[PDB]
Amino acid sequence: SSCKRHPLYVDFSDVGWNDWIVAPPGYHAFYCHGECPFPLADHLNSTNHAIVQTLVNSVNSKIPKACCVPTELSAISMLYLDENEKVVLKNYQDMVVEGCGCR
């Protein structure tokens, strides 16, 4: 079962952050997971390295396969509390998986 994006919602209340994050109450973060087989198909955006490494793996088992990771990521905004406790608006980069590939 090959590398792809899966759902993940992170509810701030569930992980106990609800008391410094004023908003949003949570968000869709997604994650990446699954095999990086050979050959690496186009929709895995693999790097030359991930590809070389994948071939090396089939011939030397001691060398791990490419891993399935975020490959494009988007930001989100939050309202949180300063080290000194009080409403602050920050843009958090690389919070949301847009796409996954083998790297």
Binding site: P37, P39, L40, D42, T47, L55, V59
Partner: protein, 85 residues
């Protein structure tokens, strides 16, 4: 460079494949794979252009043997049928 080429895909399809078809700027592939105890199975799909040369070149000795062939014409891979050396 933009996707311009259509390929059949059978175990390596993108989630959003269309009629068991993928599009790419690289090459179509078709692969034959033996496992550890007998059963041999067939694969096909699209290879990205970057690193296409290392994937469309023919290896000498993995764990169990396999072969792979590429071509660059629409739907060209149902016409490929690779065999083990």
């Amino acid at each position: 460079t933009l996707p311009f080429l259509k390929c059949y895909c059978s175990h390596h399809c993108p989630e959003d494949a269309i009629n068991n078809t993928c599009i790419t700027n690289g090459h179509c592939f078709t692969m034959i794979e033996e496992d550890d105890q007998g059963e041999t199975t067939l694969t096909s799909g699209c290879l990205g252009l970057e690193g296409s040369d290392f994937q469309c070149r023919d290896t000498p000795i993995p764990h169990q043997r396999r072969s792979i062939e590429c071509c660059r014409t629409n739907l060209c891979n149902q016409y490929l049928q690779p065999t083990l050396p």
